[model samples]
Target: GHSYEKYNNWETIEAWTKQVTSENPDLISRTAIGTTFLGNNIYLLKVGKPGPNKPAIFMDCGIHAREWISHAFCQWFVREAVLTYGYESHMTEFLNKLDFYVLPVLNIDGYIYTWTKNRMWRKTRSTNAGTTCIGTDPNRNFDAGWCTTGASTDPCDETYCGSAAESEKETKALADFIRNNLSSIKAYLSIHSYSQHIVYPYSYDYKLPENNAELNNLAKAAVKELATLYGTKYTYGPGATTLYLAPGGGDDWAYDQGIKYSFTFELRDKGRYGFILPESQIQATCEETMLAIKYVTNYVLGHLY
Candidate 1:
């Protein structure tokens, strides 16, 4: 319903969520999972034909506020799914077989603040109890290996893990939704930007996941598919080794919860632009990332029992 011609504001993107679902009612549906700390509604756009017990992928973007490209790609994904459903045979088959639960912006308050106040905000805007610091890093607030590595307990730190696991309302709401629907969600994908990496579990420590081979193989294949689009290169591996230690990352938690195909993507430019990636590159970024996602989705679909 809206153009991905350039990076858009949160209001425009949120409006697109409702608009697109209504415009493509036969192919898409929207649900308000919960409200953020600032009272903004966090929505999930479910893209697929209705079915019972269909395997699905749960994808979230913009867990960190300043990662603008992460937010853009989720919007791009919804648009691509709706526009290509009938016209693209592979997409048609994918939608008919599996569902995509896409959360376009996970940190809505932080995202809004990035636009209005600061451009480098990277956490949720909920104030911690007993501290003046305005937010907690939602990415670091998950229950999986939380605050053990690459995270902080101090409220002033960027990677502050909050008072406890799932402490932030935004983090708790998302975790609760995934926990409730664990049976049908076969894959978990969280999108971020500025490192050009695709990584899997064990972010809290150096330990490897049991299904390391399968996850690595899928990530390798997905990266290869992604590279074919614009000669864009992506490194793939476990989170601790490949992307540095980030305790309580979404991908790690999802895998621990039995969504075996969990992966996190750090997209585009490799620090040339960092968080403020140019909107001019949005189209190409989304185009290539879409390829990698389809590769992973296809693999997951084929393996679903």
Candidate 2:
């Protein structure tokens, strides 16, 4: 009932999650990892053929509610997986060998808020103790470098780090899921938008990951793959350097958790339309993004040592 190329509201996305799983039970199955602050279930879709002890790539979108393209990319990823499992050679092998655990919308409350109240809303819709501020930047809620540089201490700030690490229920659930599934998840991919860049770890600090060289080469190749479809240019490097220092980001936490292929993909347009990306550009954005994700998937499959 929903179009893949359009930004879907929380209700539509939540419904589509079940419908997609129901339509393709063999390849995709849905599970609720946990609940959000607003009591909405966080749905995780496992997209892959059932195989014995297969490693998984854990992906999430809509950590920032207003980044609709991020949510769209997660949906697009699952669609591509189920649709091309047998026909597309790379996808077939990918599904057969590895599982992709995709969380379509992590911040459901804020997503609902974005659609119903404010179009540009970001953060989780949780109440603060003293003030009337009603949210925390889920990205800044992670324990890694919590409330450090590049993060805000005030509850009213956009980059507010929350009361403490894993403070926001949305981010806490996400972290818990990753913690429990630590051994099986070989990679972590976070989808964000408006700046076309493939960033690796050390987002919380100016430091580098243990496997910096390997991460660099992988990011280089992945960004290159993304450019093939529409000649979409993307800069690739450490997030703290290539982009800004976003402390407590999920990618940095995931890397610290020992996931070697931790990457955060900033998809489409160099601020032309910003977060209000048009529906017309969705297909091209998602199509090109698929190539980059597939590249990372293939790389992870071969390098699982």
Candidate 3:
């Protein structure tokens, strides 16, 4: 009953996770990795047929509060899984071979803040002890090359790195999950917005990943496949050059955790609409993004090391 084109608030999406998981018991199950700063339960939907020892592709969306489309895509992904399994050949096989841990919204406090207060919030709602600022950029609170570059030490800034790594409860929750599930989570994908870039590891600095060539090639192929849907142009490369050197990014942390296929998808528009991407474009945006996600999933399934 839930639609993908429109963005959903915390309650609706949380409930949708329950409803979807209950209805598709064979394909999806729900759990709370941890709670937000506001104590809101962060739901993670494990999408796939039940299996023993299947590798996983960990993905999270709306890490930035204002990236509504990012949130929408995660819901679309689950719905697509439910809708396509046993019907779409690739998805059917992919689900059987791999599990997708989809965190629809990681920054719960910031997401709710976006809906109720500012439509442009981009961090968690945890209070800074020394200052009056109310949030820390969760993406900037991870442990990889943390606070070394391209991140602010000041709590008042937009890209504040927090007092220490994983300071935000949301970030700590995610990091803890990955740490615990390290053996099975083969890949990590974080979704963001306002750019058309598919970037891989080392956002904290300019050094390339160990499998730099492989990631670059994979990103290129995935980007090409995505364009087949809507002719959307995309750039693919190492994060430092393709995007920027955003120290302590979640992608880098996951990569450093030995998840070899970590990548960040910066979806839709080149700042024509910025974070407030229109609802009308949600369906179109998600449709093409699906192509790349599925491409990456299938590729991972085939090339597991």
Candidate 4:
């Protein structure tokens, strides 16, 4: 059940990312964009040509520690990008048009500890001087609404918002990366697990964005495409109403930063497996997610200037 060979750890994930970038020097450029709270690498995969203003698609997974399927999808995606582009023409066309920035894991310290101590760790391990509590929910620590309605004040709470905006190191690193890419990133997708939902901005409140109609239409179209092949249905909506109120979520933060096509995908299982989604299920998860992702990317790609 606890096999590192199949499940993997922090170092292994880093090594795999490094190896992929190294193997595809022509197409893929890798950067340790930043470090996590515990000094783990926040890896960034850049796929496409370098330029002053190339349009970009930003995707990240494993922001929550227990979502192994989320990370697996990125690994599968990168491998597919490499393998397909190694011989395929269509893949090349896609890459030639837009750069894909993939961050496979966001909460690495908690992820490693999940493999060892707890299987459901959902936050980042950080020191709180006044409290003995161990982790802060990186998802709730962003600057959008901060600790307002959807987050917790209790340091030990699962959805604890840290002391301030982007307070946690993991979140700060992500904020840094997103801010740096703000001008080029046309779309932002942060992946997570078990609910099979595709959510958009305004997670901290019920109000919709000015582009709500277009965003809703886009999500509907993308989910339709995804379900056509895999038959994996996904609910689409605002995060606060569809799932739960979660302030400081990356999805809303990205939208605030001008990346209009922002999304947070709750991937696979619909509660049958919860966190321990098997390796056998990884392919379908990637396949369906890939469809939705590509659909959104295609739309954004066309609109990007």
Candidate 5:
């Protein structure tokens, strides 16, 4: 319903990619290195000033099908990157120092299904043989903490961990991409919504990651910047403690891969609208998110060892 390009089908998102890259050749290019079960392109937007060994931040949103605000943040992020380059020197400067690899919608098939079929869908739409059950929660399909302390194995359960680790197309693509880009990506920020909390690894259990202190500090710092602007206070901690633990999450995998700064953000409204976060909140939600993002970027740029 918004001019920001809502796709009723995969064709629309594909077309938008074409137009976006064509119009902003230098700033935007689509990477189809990954594909969904339906073969929809798992696009990645690589943006930054040219340089050797420029550290990168892997920012992905809408990993869950119902989180509409997560998708909106991605579009708003790129818009700010392109049009506000000179006018907003802070954002411009952040883009200069950081290479943003943004995947606007990670779970394409599920996201599309959310629009046309089920508004509460939470998993990949890959049908398994002999099972009438439809999809596996991609969030709970990661290689780490999979099927362990906080996940469900039943195909119909909301937190289904899938048959095995990285079993879902979405998780496979994202995990591979993270592994391939491990050398340069100093941090990973996977955005979700309705919890207003910033979470870091070891979701498989309550035990903290080796870099637990650093992760907590980084999350606090991110929220502090957000608080300064809008007085939005976001709780920050290990995933298991701060939020309900559901394993196989991307953040834990990134942490296991030595990306110590891996963080997952659960954005605004704290469940008032749930996944249906209103369009009116888009501007404020985005503004708050950007401040947290910039804070993380600055920390990585200076402190990453």
Candidate 6:
């Protein structure tokens, strides 16, 4: 089993990624999707049996560097998928049918920076032309409603949008991958932390997508499944209506790109621990979150006509 005794560094996480994928060749395979700004290889793990092109779900964690819990959950997910696929009937059927593309940590450089240099860094390590400031919010650099609202033009800001949509290499790489694989990818899940929410599209504005009802129903069911494990209550709605308007969210962009089941999860503790959640809470958080993801997976598999 993978260690969850403490929050880990990027090197440890990278090692775990390689080990797990290498060990479980039948169920999982790792690919170098792209390279980060600091030349770190961004890896995506494909979990499932090899088959014809099948409907899939795309999940990513650690878009923001400080959100360490988000990254931990992604690792937990990989472990669970490998360890439980055949023994757990649901996982067996899920994997036997739909492929899961999991990018454990997308902001590799920023995540490394959080572990080594600053514990609170929240953006990529890309340098702009004019400022000495060092990063853009990868979450805010997506093409959907880029810099429209809730994002800053200034490089110094935490929510700074890059000069153009998908300007940051990390964001651009993810975007390019999604666009290229849009046919087989039907669901998109981006994991974040500290708010306990399952939010859907239109993060940049209040307008609801045409499939709002279907999205809301799925979120409701997923959160219900999540609550069963720990009674972890979650609020679900559009990003703008449920929470606040946040332009250029990955979920928003994915939804706009025709992935109907796009959603972002803000995992664990409203604000008690914020970004500094203890390691002890990892299993419980992961267990409950896994149920929610499986619930969504079931829904996606059934609905993919």
Candidate 6 TM-score over all chains jointly? 0.97
Clashing pairs in 5: none
As a whole number from 0 to 100, the lDDT of residue 159 in candidate 6 is 92
For candidate 6, the lDDT comes to 0.89
- Tens-digit lDDT string for candidate 3 (164-250): 998888999999998998999988999999789999988898999889999989999999999997899999899888778898899
Give a tens-digit lDDT track for model 1, residues 134-245.
8999989999898986999889999999889998888988999999899989999999988999989989999899999988899999999999989999998999998789
The CA lDDT at 163 in model 5 is: 84
Instruction: Write down the RMSD of all candidates, one decimal each.
Output: 1.1, 0.9, 1.0, 2.3, 1.9, 1.2
- True-structure lDDT of candidate 1: 0.90
Candidate 1: which stretches are off by over 4 Å?
Answer: none
State the number of backbone clashes in model 3: 0
- Which pairs clash in the backbone of model 6? none
Error of 5 at 78 (Å): 1.1
Report the lDDT of model 4 for residue 257. Answer: 83
Error of 4 at 37 (Å): 1.8
Superposed on all Cα atoms, model 6 deviates from the true structure by an RMSD in Å of 1.2
Give Cα distance to truth, residue 51, candidate 6, Å: 1.3
Model 5 Cα lDDT, one tens digit per residue, 1-305? 22453423445656666677777877777787588988888988887666677788898887888888888788778777878776786777777777889998889998999888998887888886667998888888998877887788688777888888988888899998988889888888898887788888878788888877877878888888888878987898988888878788898888888887888888987767877877778888888888898788878877866
The Cα error of candidate 3 at residue 267, in Å, is 0.6
Give the residue spans of candidate 4 off by over 4 A.
1-6, 86-90
In model 3, state the lDDT of residue 253.
92
